Each structure stands twice: as structure tokens, then as C-alpha cells.
Amino acid sequence: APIRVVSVPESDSFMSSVPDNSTPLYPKVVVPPRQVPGRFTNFIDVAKQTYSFCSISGKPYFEVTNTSGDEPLFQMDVSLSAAELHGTYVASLSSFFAQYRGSLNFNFIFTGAAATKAKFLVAFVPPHSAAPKTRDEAMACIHAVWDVGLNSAFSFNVPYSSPADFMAVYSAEATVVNVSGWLQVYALTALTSTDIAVNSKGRVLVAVSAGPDFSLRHPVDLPDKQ
Amino acid sequence: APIRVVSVPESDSFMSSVPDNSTPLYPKVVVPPRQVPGRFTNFIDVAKQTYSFCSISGKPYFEVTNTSGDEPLFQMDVSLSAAELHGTYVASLSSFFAQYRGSLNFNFIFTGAAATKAKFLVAFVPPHSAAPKTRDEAMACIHAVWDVGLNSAFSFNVPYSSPADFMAVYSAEATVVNVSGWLQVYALTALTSTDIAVNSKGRVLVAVSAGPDFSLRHPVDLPDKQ
Amino acid sequence: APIRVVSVPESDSFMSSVPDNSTPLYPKVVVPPRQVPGRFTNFIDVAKQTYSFCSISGKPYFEVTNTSGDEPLFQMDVSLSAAELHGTYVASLSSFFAQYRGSLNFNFIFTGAAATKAKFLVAFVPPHSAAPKTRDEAMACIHAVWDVGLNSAFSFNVPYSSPADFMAVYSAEATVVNVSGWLQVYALTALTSTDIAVNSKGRVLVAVSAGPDFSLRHPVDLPDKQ
Amino acid sequence: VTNVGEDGEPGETEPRHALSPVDMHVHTDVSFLLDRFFDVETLELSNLTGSPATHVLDPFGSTAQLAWARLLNTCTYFFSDLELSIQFKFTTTPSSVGEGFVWVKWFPVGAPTKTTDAWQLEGGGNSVRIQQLAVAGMSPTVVFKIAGSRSQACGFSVPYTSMWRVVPVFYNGWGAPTKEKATYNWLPGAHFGSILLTSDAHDKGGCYLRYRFPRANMYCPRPIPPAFTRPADKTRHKFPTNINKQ
Amino acid sequence: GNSGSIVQNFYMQQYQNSIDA
Amino acid sequence: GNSGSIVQNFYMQQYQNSIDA
Amino acid sequence: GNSGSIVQNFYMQQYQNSIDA
Amino acid sequence: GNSGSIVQNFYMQQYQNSIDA
Amino acid sequence: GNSGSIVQNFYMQQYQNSIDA
């Protein structure tokens, strides 16, 4: 008559992720409909269909003067906790996890006078050297050149290239898996204005859209606040 | 309403081989593909399709001089922990277990000058006497004769013959189940060279391939290191 | 989600005959075939197709002299622990149990000189009186007469007759269920020989075959040794 | 048979009445032999307070040859899930912890660390802290008592975390662009994760970690390490067995 | 969501959870 | 033999017992 | 491998283990 | 009424409850 | 008689009870 069973040693323990609920103490509670639009099932979803300003210096944009040329314009170690990619949606989302596998996109919204032209260059430096510091060094890598004047912004896709199928959403001392490299933009042509008088500098917004192959795997509690 | 059950006395105990897993605390973890070739499911598999040098004296080979004749050339008690069969893949695999049921094969890779010939004899002595010590005694058993010169190596299959369906992967004091006998090779014709001057000795490698009917049953923890 | 159950009070107890095994800690152990003949599934089986010498006096046989006549030849209280039926297979088997329901058979292997004849009588005395002590008293019951000379042995089936469907494999103080009666054999004709000189006595073996309707029910531990 | 050796590939001979199989090799099956909770490692828990030493489930080290060590280093790359079973051997008088909650929290390859205090349970006074990252949430916690518990143990699944398509055992190269003595056979996270054990105990008991390696896939064979000295030539090695003589 | 055990519906979905419309 | 409960095959007969040929 | 009990799939294989591709 | 578990009929409705006519 | 639970036959009726003829 009575069934025969054996408790596992574990048995009367907790389990903070038991695939299966608990005992339904209140029942039959019918719930009212919801008419609110702008709903979501997936979080990656929102960061793909939405950019966020990267924080260069304390602002979300770099400058372009008619006295630049050689010098780098913008640089940062492509890892989801590198300075610039700190305040972004896409990067702040990440920290509920431990891993990402995606190429990112950036959009350069030039905001200088409508009598200003700046022309220009972006470059992705895979990890190896110790940060090229002149386009003449950087142009020998993957780069794109762009001429503001009629465009009114631009887009560059920093891909995913590495031996590991997933990388780290957390930066740390130089590993083959932390760093994916740098992202760089250069003054391929020092800015110009109707008068150097009226128009001193031009600027450019650096917006970060999640790439089209990007995804976060593995949820993880939050460490300490540092 | 509530089901009726009865715990076995055992119940809340361990069990280091419970046919059934545990509680899945992390789920949905999709895993990336693997493109590495040279993969395996079964361990016997690798020792069958692969030999390993038996350690005679401290080396994996015996000699052949033009002063031998009677004397034995190589001898060892066919049991998976007998000296020679100590360093071999096939023998070192074994010790995760307790039993084997297979006839073994050996390959004799003669390495003497290409101006050398040695001719020769192998012999399997089933357990009974106390080690025949001259071919004239040994040839009356199962043996094979071989002539290096154009061959460039040879193969001998030491079968399985005994009343027990499985034997011991561990050697011990003389039992009907430990010892399967000896393996012997003889100088059926003392070596020869272009000049006794240039070519002193010839050698021969003793490689051990797992037999075609050989298998290990029963896993067992490792004892002490002795 | 979690199922609702209730342990019986008994619960975490032993049970030395739980219809159901235990946890399989070693698995997949394929087992080698068996070629040994003379195998058995049932124990009754072996005692049916096999007799066993009843121990009269300390020997398995009675005598027959040409000075007998009236006196009883062999007698014993038909219960599976009565003297004679003590050493027999059929009786020694019994004690792993508590009950039997069978009529027994006995075979009388006469061993006297081939110049000897004895003629004779067997008799089954159901329980009532206090042991008839002359055939003239016993022949009025169920009996069989037999003449050695050309036969070379004989068979008598002591049936089962009683109000209970099973009796006791253990003898005890006079009960309606212990005793099934006596078994008796008589000198219906005092033995004869070529010469009273050469051939003094004749003998006869008393072998006990389990009957054709006999069976043991109920296993029981063994008491003390007495 | 005449062997023309030297070109790798073995060479067989095949006698007469070849012998029939039985057992079916089966007991030598990789995935099978490795699907059983082994007793590997053993540590000391944490006090709820202070900073922890995040333990890491890297069972690709070997040494004490408990036939599980060698077996893992018979392959080159390995991919399998994991499952654990912590137990906890009391070290003194097993009646000094009238409760002992143990916050076994597992972490996946890459999860942060730095775990100082942040929790605190308020009740009538005293208040006992819990480790910040120890609490429950994202990465599976298990709370089991160390009192009256007829098995001061737990146990669960842990699917393959690590980024690598497969786990390389022995790496020839390095782990970081800092070709440093250490990062040789390291490689960033060739493992199964971590675990943080905190309980009002920490002393008065240890543990005995365990691993159940279901779905073990092995690649690129390697040589299998002897594990026993060499004997006296010509003869047998004699270990006291079930069998033996007397 | 994280309930992939075939015992979750011991309590039918009325008692279990809620309902919309 | 003495195992007449419909739970004996929780562990399939490979793990349960042995096998002959 | 060593899981020959008809309860192993109480947690469907998604929660149980991993998946390849 | 409040019994939406598929184990309520372990005891068939005769033993469980009553009956009318 | 008083056994109206669908678990009574966990032990088949041979082990459970007796048998007549």
C-alpha cells in the first residue's frame, strides 16, 4: 500500500533557482487586462533598438579644431566597463550578467556650425601593440573615413573577433578574453569655418547602439560597489 | 488527498553512484559547438588502435648478438602489472579497473644496421612449469620464428586461454587467475653483420597493442601508491 | 508545485521481506553465460525425483529372520521429525518451513542372498489406538503384502488423510495435526535360505521418495539446535 | 604476421577460436565512468563577516591519483557539465553549532567578486550579517542547516559556464599578453565556476566537495600516467586484492 | 520562465497563478 | 521473486541487476 | 551515462543540462 | 471549491466525502 | 472494504493478500 521513497541527502534545503514554483495559498484570483503600450519581454531587445551616449571626459562628445591632425581624437579599450562605455544603457545592462558576444555600433553626430566641415577618420585597433598614437600608425588597421557636410552624422561597426565564443562583461587585468582592443577616431583633416572667429570648434556625439549579433548570457549578482 | 509514503531505512544517505542526477539550479544554458577532431567515447578504443613500448631493463628493446643461441632473450609473466607491461598505455589504463579478458599483441621492430640479419624465435609458455630456460625446452610450446631481412618488424598474438571468463588487472601471489603465463623470445640464430667490427649489436622494439578481443570491466578506486 | 505526501507512522523502519529491492549502486555489469547442467528452480522438485535412506536403528534397513512372525518389523510415527524420517532429504528440507501436505512413498530394496526368499507385509495405521503390535491386529488396516523372489524391491504409498489442509513439518505433543499415524512392516512369512547356515538374515532398504501430491508451504527461521 | 612497422599504425595477429566479447567494452566508456560524484578537494568555509577567497571549481589539476585525476588528463580538451554535493565533516564536538546555515552560492565563469558586508538580519538586538554577494539572487544559493540534519549536505546541477567551445586541459602558450610564469598552463578560465561558503560555522567543520561530470566529452587522447613504480624485472607486481592467496 | 519540472501543474493554473481576460 | 511492487523498475534493469547473454 | 532511472527527466533537458547547437 | 490539485482523488469520492441520492 | 485509495495495488495482490482457488 504505502509507496517507498528515499530522500536525497540534500533534501530539506533551500535552492534559490528551483525550476518549479511553490504552494498556491490564494487561488482563482482573476486579474484585470492591461492596455499599456511600449512593453517588453527581452532586455537585449531594448538596447539593440536604442543608443546611449558614451561619456567622453564627462560629456558625450569630442571636439574638432583646425589645429589637430596627428593626435588621436577618441580612444578606449573595447570592454564593457571601459570608461566611455560606462554610462551607456548597453553597458549598464550588462552588469546583471557575466558574458557578451557582440560587435557594437557607434554613431557620430557632428554638431558644429552649419558653415563648418570637418572631414575625419575612425579606426579599430585589435589587441597587440600598445595603442598606436598617430593615424599614420593607425590607418594601417581597419578604419573608416568620413566627411561631414551633407551627411549630418555617421555609423561605425566595431566587430567581434576573438578565439573565445563569449567574453567578459567585466574588465580586469590584461587577459586574452577581457580586452577586444581599442576604438579610435582621428583628425584626417583639421576642422574649417566661415571664420575661425565665429566658429572655433565643432563637436560630435558618440552614441552606442548594441550590435546586431550581440547578446548577454549568464545572470550574476552584483559584487560590491567600487 | 495527501499521498501515503514510507521512507526506506537507508533514506537520507549519500550514494556515490546513484543512477540519476541532482536538482538543476541553473537552466537554459545553451552551449557553443566544438570543432576539435580526435575525439573519443571509449577508452578501450584508444589502446586497441595504439601500441606502447614495453620497458625492458629501462629501455623499450632487447639486443641480438652473434654470441647468443640458447639463452632466453625476453621473458615476463603475462599479467597486467608484470614489469615490462608496466609503462604501457594498455597496462596503465587498466588500473582504473579490476578485470581484463583479452589476448594481446606485440610487434618486434628490429632496428639493426641495414647490413644486419638476425633470423629468431618467439614463444608463449602457458602457466605450469617454472620458466623454460632454453628454446630446446620452449620450442615444444607455442612459438613463432621470424627472419629480419626484408620484413622490417614482426607481430605475435599472445592469446587468452584460461578457465575464468575475466582475469586480474592486478598481479598478486601465484593464483590460477593472476598469471596467464610468460612471453618469451629467443635467438634461433645468433645475429650477423657486414663486419663484426661496424655492427656489434642489433636491437628490437617490443610494442604492445591491445588485442582484438580484449576489454576491461569494473572500475575501482586507486589503492595506495606502491 | 511541490507534491503533498504523508509518511505512515511505520516509515523509517527496516522490513526483512519488502516486496521490492534497493538502490542500484553499480550498473551495466553484463554477466557471463553458464553451461552447467543439473540446475534447479524448485526444491520440492529434487526431493520428488529422489529418495533418501530412512535411518532405522542407526542403519538404513531392517532384518528378516526365519524366527519372526508376529512381532512388528518397522514402525514410526508418520510426522516429518519422527526418528526414521530424520536423516532423509525430504525431511531435512522441510525444516526451512512449517507445513507439508503430501502422501509419501517408500521403497523396500531387499538385499538378502540370491537364494533367499522372504515374502512379507506392510501396513499404515491411521491415528487412534496405541500402536497395534501383531499383524493379526494390523492387517485389519490398510496393508500390502509382498514376495521377494524375482521382484528385487517394492513400493508403498503412505497417503494423506486428515481434516486439515496442511500439517506440521515439526512434531510436538500429540495433536490432531502433528501425527498422521504409523508406518509398519511385518513378517507375513519368516525368511528362508539354501541353508540356515550360509544365509542367516536378509535385509531390506527403506528409501523415502517424496509423494506425488506433497508440498511444503511457509518458510520459517531455524529455532535452536536440539 | 610480418609487420612493416615504423609508420605509426600498430599491427595485430588474431589467433584461432578468437574469444567471444561479453561486458561489451561498456565499463571503459568515458562519459559513463565520469558521471559519478567523486570526492575531490576539501576546504574551509567563511565567517559571514570580512572578505572571502572565492573558491574555483577547476578539476583539471590532478596529483593525488584517486583514479579520477588521471582519466581527466587522458584527454586534451574536455567538455562536460557539473553537479556538486557539499557535505561537511564536523571537526570537534558535533553539538556546538545549534543551527549553522551555510550560504553555498555558486558563480558562473566571469562573475564578479569583491564581497564585503551589506546584509544584516535585525532581531531583538545582536543582528547577524550575511556576505554581500552571498545572499540570494541571480546565481543559485542553497541554505542548509548544520544541526540535526541527517546529512549536512546539499547538491545540484551546474551547466557549462566557460566561454571556450571546449575546455583545454594542458595549454601550450599563455593566458594573457603578459607572458608571465603562471599564465603558461593557465588560459583565462578553463573551468566550471566558483562557490562561496559562508555560515556561522567556518570552524568546527570542513566539507568534501564532489563532482558529477555528466555529458563528459573528451578529445585528443593523451598518454596515461603509470601511477605505480616499476617492479623487479621479469616479474609481477603484487597488490593485496579481494582475490589474492589467503 | 524558470519552472521546467513536470510537477508544476500539480495545482492547476487558477490556484497556481492569476488569469488576465 | 519477492519484488511485486510496481516501483521496482524505477531503475531500469541494466542498473538494477546484471545481464547474462 | 549512469542515470537509468525514470525520474531523471522531472526537470526537462534545458534546465537539467546544457545544449550544443 | 478550493481543491485544485490533481491528488485530491487519491481517496476516491466515497471515502473522501459523502454522497446525496 | 476500507481501502479506497489508488495506491493500494502498489504491491500486487499476491504479495498484498492471499488467494483462494
XYZ file of C-alpha atoms in Angstrom, chain C residues 25-126:
102
model
C 24.797 1.428 -6.861
C 26.759 -0.427 -9.598
C 25.276 -0.701 -13.042
C 25.610 -2.149 -16.549
C 27.501 -5.162 -15.230
C 26.977 -7.649 -18.073
C 27.353 -11.247 -16.722
C 28.923 -14.328 -18.481
C 26.822 -17.369 -19.540
C 26.579 -20.621 -17.609
C 26.856 -24.065 -19.183
C 26.399 -26.236 -16.009
C 23.708 -28.919 -16.199
C 21.740 -30.296 -13.250
C 20.163 -26.952 -12.365
C 17.077 -26.227 -10.379
C 14.382 -23.640 -9.738
C 12.304 -25.626 -7.218
C 13.331 -27.555 -4.133
C 10.271 -29.738 -3.895
C 11.389 -30.840 -7.355
C 14.617 -32.517 -6.118
C 13.024 -34.446 -3.246
C 10.280 -35.806 -5.526
C 12.730 -37.097 -8.123
C 14.983 -38.526 -5.393
C 14.745 -40.892 -2.428
C 16.834 -40.982 0.746
C 17.534 -43.708 3.228
C 15.497 -43.610 6.420
C 17.728 -44.254 9.492
C 16.332 -47.357 11.314
C 18.391 -48.122 14.460
C 21.466 -46.311 13.010
C 21.286 -48.068 9.635
C 19.009 -47.716 6.617
C 17.397 -51.193 6.716
C 15.640 -53.797 8.877
C 16.212 -57.588 9.011
C 14.167 -60.702 8.211
C 14.855 -63.938 10.048
C 13.122 -67.349 9.974
C 12.173 -66.856 13.659
C 9.955 -63.738 13.349
C 6.235 -63.912 12.500
C 4.048 -61.925 14.938
C 6.293 -59.100 16.036
C 6.347 -55.757 14.183
C 9.289 -55.313 11.821
C 9.394 -51.465 11.403
C 7.251 -48.716 12.993
C 7.424 -44.912 13.215
C 5.027 -42.029 13.736
C 4.413 -40.559 10.338
C 5.414 -36.933 11.033
C 8.366 -35.168 9.403
C 10.552 -35.273 12.526
C 9.859 -38.896 13.633
C 13.108 -40.808 14.066
C 13.451 -42.642 10.781
C 12.353 -39.713 8.675
C 15.046 -37.641 10.416
C 18.064 -38.012 8.110
C 16.141 -38.085 4.866
C 16.432 -35.392 2.186
C 12.692 -34.925 2.146
C 12.572 -34.437 5.972
C 15.714 -32.256 6.306
C 14.417 -29.966 3.517
C 11.214 -29.486 5.483
C 12.743 -27.661 8.421
C 13.258 -24.418 6.437
C 9.481 -24.340 6.696
C 6.418 -25.031 8.874
C 3.929 -27.043 6.761
C 3.557 -30.061 4.391
C 0.571 -31.606 2.567
C 1.678 -34.834 0.995
C 1.471 -38.550 0.946
C 4.858 -40.267 0.960
C 6.241 -43.229 -0.780
C 8.720 -45.813 0.451
C 10.673 -48.411 -1.475
C 11.790 -51.734 0.046
C 15.022 -52.902 -1.505
C 15.527 -56.405 -0.272
C 19.291 -57.283 -0.091
C 19.368 -60.925 1.066
C 21.236 -63.787 -0.682
C 20.005 -64.580 -4.123
C 18.998 -67.968 -2.581
C 16.743 -66.231 -0.105
C 13.053 -65.518 -0.213
C 11.171 -63.655 2.463
C 7.581 -62.947 1.272
C 6.181 -60.118 3.872
C 3.676 -57.304 4.810
C 3.473 -53.520 5.129
C 0.708 -51.541 6.962
C -0.346 -47.949 7.528
C -2.159 -47.400 10.827
C -4.179 -44.198 10.912
